[PDB]
């Protein structure tokens with residue numbers, strides 16, 4: 001049932017500065033009022049991250065991106081447009097692939113041999129009769145066989161109505177694939193910023209530790225399409241994109257100096273060997 | 286050691302707490318979900334005249 | 335069954351269930367067996383004797 005999307009306007013990729021962003025708790029041990037030095041896969045400080053923004057004004061982006069030893073993925077949203085990811089190597093059913101999706105009722109995590117579509121997306125439909133939205137289209141994969149791991153979350157419902165105004169939610173993720181474990185660290189913050197990544201500090205907490213045992217080198221973000229009476233044409237053109245943005249950076253093996261405050265929260269950090277001053281801060285602790 | 290009541294608020298994914306010397310200070314009691322601080326029970330200098 | 339041919343060694347706790355034809359030689363195999371084109375999986379022959 002998959003259909004390609006044709007009404008697109010190509011643009012060069014944008015780049016943004018990540019300012020002391022993408023720190024996570026390295027272990028599950030409580031530490032308070034301490035300067036702890038650790039070495040792990042971190043997003044380097046003051047680092048250039050690729051920016052993909054889906055707007056109509058139609059400019060929307062969901063390309064297949066590399067997965068270089070881990071990914072930091074930020075998403076600024078107001079209407080729940082970015083709703084999952086695809087991970088794998090070839091994404092063509094010759095190899096196993098991982099699918100994380102929130103389809104507005106459940107969060108599904110499947111490691112399975114998917115025959116993925118060239119333009120995978122989900123789709124919500126505007127109703128003029130009553131002011132209500134319902135998710136209608138699920139065009140992620142064509143077939144699924146030999147289907148190893150599966151988790152389905154408890155049922156829910158989320159506000160998939162298209163909001164108008166400013167971005168409100170910032171959802172930050174760190175994905176890494178170590179020793180057969182896909183580790184996800186997550187953090188949601190409320191914001192009121194319009195365009196770029198917020199400037200500040202927020203530490204990502206461990207969420208999952210999925211035992212998938214999958215080689216992962218490429219990944220692709222899954223977005224949601226509004227379809228309305230105001231959008232004419234067939235399924236390939238009769239659609240519009242809600243305003244949302246996401247940012248992708250890549251983790252590197254780095255030494256960090258984390259500061260745990262009196263309540264056990266990582267409030268600040270120093271990216272060691274960023275600049276010589278940071279090295280001095282490391283040595284002095 | 287000596288186990289005492291704690292004001293520390295563990296995150297749900299944490300079970301232990303440690304000094305900068307990596308020795309365990311606080312532990313979440315697995316039966317009753319409360320935090321208990323652990324203190325060495327030997328302390329204080331002693332001299333013989 | 336066990337995998338007898340692979341292009342590279344597995345990572346720890348990694349699973350590979352793909353059944354693509356292994357190109358032992360230089361010419362591509364194009365999804366069919368033949369000379370220097372092996373099915374990667376082979377079955378154990380388990381007999382009680």
Ligand SMILES: C=CC1=C(C)/C(=C/c2[nH]c(/C=C3N=C(/C=C4\NC(=O)C(C)=C4C=C)C(C)=C\3CCC(=O)O)c(CCC(=O)O)c2C)NC1=O
Pocket residue numbers: 080081082083084085100101102107158159171186
């Ligand atoms: C994609 C997989 C996915 C993950 C990993 C996820 C994590 C996650 N999101 C949550 C809240 C939530 N998460 C969302 C929606 C999202 N948050 C996101 O990161 C994304 C992509 C969406 C979908 C667009 C909403 C609406 C809430 C509730 C916020 C509220 O209280 O209003 C919670 C807290 C649930 C609780 O209260 O017990 C978790 C654990 N949610 C997901 O859907």
Ligand SMILES: *[C@@H]1O[C@H](CO)[C@@H](O[C@@H]2O[C@H](CO)[C@@H](O)[C@H](O)[C@H]2NC(C)=O)[C@H](O)[C@H]1NC(C)=O
Pocket residue numbers: 103104105106108135138152155
């Ligand atoms: C979102 O995904 C889940 C899992 O695919 C769907 O839940 C399943 O739906 C099928 C068909 O109705 C049932 O056979 C299963 O029992 C359901 N499993 C559950 C609830 O755990 C769900 O329907 C999807 N929701 C939307 C809006 O697409």
Ligand SMILES: *[C@@H]1O[C@H](CO)[C@@H](O[C@@H]2O[C@H](CO)[C@@H](O)[C@H](O)[C@H]2NC(C)=O)[C@H](O)[C@H]1NC(C)=O
Pocket residue numbers: 089215216217341342343344345
């Ligand atoms: C994990 O996936 C990547 C991509 O398939 C594999 O790397 C490729 O290996 C073949 C071997 O001939 C090369 O031709 C490709 O150029 C490689 N591509 C990249 C991006 O590296 C890798 O071998 C796989 N790792 C394991 C353990 O299976």
Ligand SMILES: *[C@@H]1O[C@H](CO)[C@@H](O)[C@H](O)[C@H]1NC(C)=O
Pocket residue numbers: 002003004005118119
């Ligand atoms: C277009 O769709 C067909 C099948 O739906 C697919 O084979 C093809 O790869 C798609 N092309 C692009 C550019 O998406």
Ligand SMILES: *[C@@H]1O[C@H](CO)[C@@H](O)[C@H](O)[C@H]1NC(C)=O
Pocket residue numbers: 015047048
């Ligand atoms: C890397 O960061 C610099 C800013 O210092 C930016 O100009 C550049 O665009 C980024 N890299 C790429 C490929 O854009």
Ligand SMILES: *[C@@H]1O[C@H](CO)[C@@H](O)[C@H](O)[C@H]1NC(C)=O
Pocket residue numbers: 127129130132133134
């Ligand atoms: C009300 O909204 C739902 C989904 O949003 C739709 O299925 C239904 O048709 C609407 N009711 C009427 C009378 O159109």
Ligand SMILES: *[C@@H]1O[C@H](CO)[C@@H](O)[C@H](O)[C@H]1NC(C)=O
Pocket residue numbers: 145146147351
């Ligand atoms: C993979 O799928 C094919 C076709 O269904 C089947 O022959 C094969 O046994 C499957 N292998 C595994 C490990 O499931």
Ligand SMILES: *[C@@H]1O[C@H](CO)[C@@H](O)[C@H](O)[C@H]1NC(C)=O
Pocket residue numbers: 261262263
């Ligand atoms: C730590 O938690 C207490 C709540 O009892 C709060 O009053 C205090 O502000 C918190 N400390 C910091 C630095 O946020």
Ligand SMILES: *[C@@H]1O[C@H](CO)[C@@H](O)[C@H](O)[C@H]1NC(C)=O
Pocket residue numbers: 316317
């Ligand atoms: C038994 O387990 C429950 C937690 O499910 C706990 O509340 C309770 O304290 C335990 N019983 C005793 C005697 O501790």
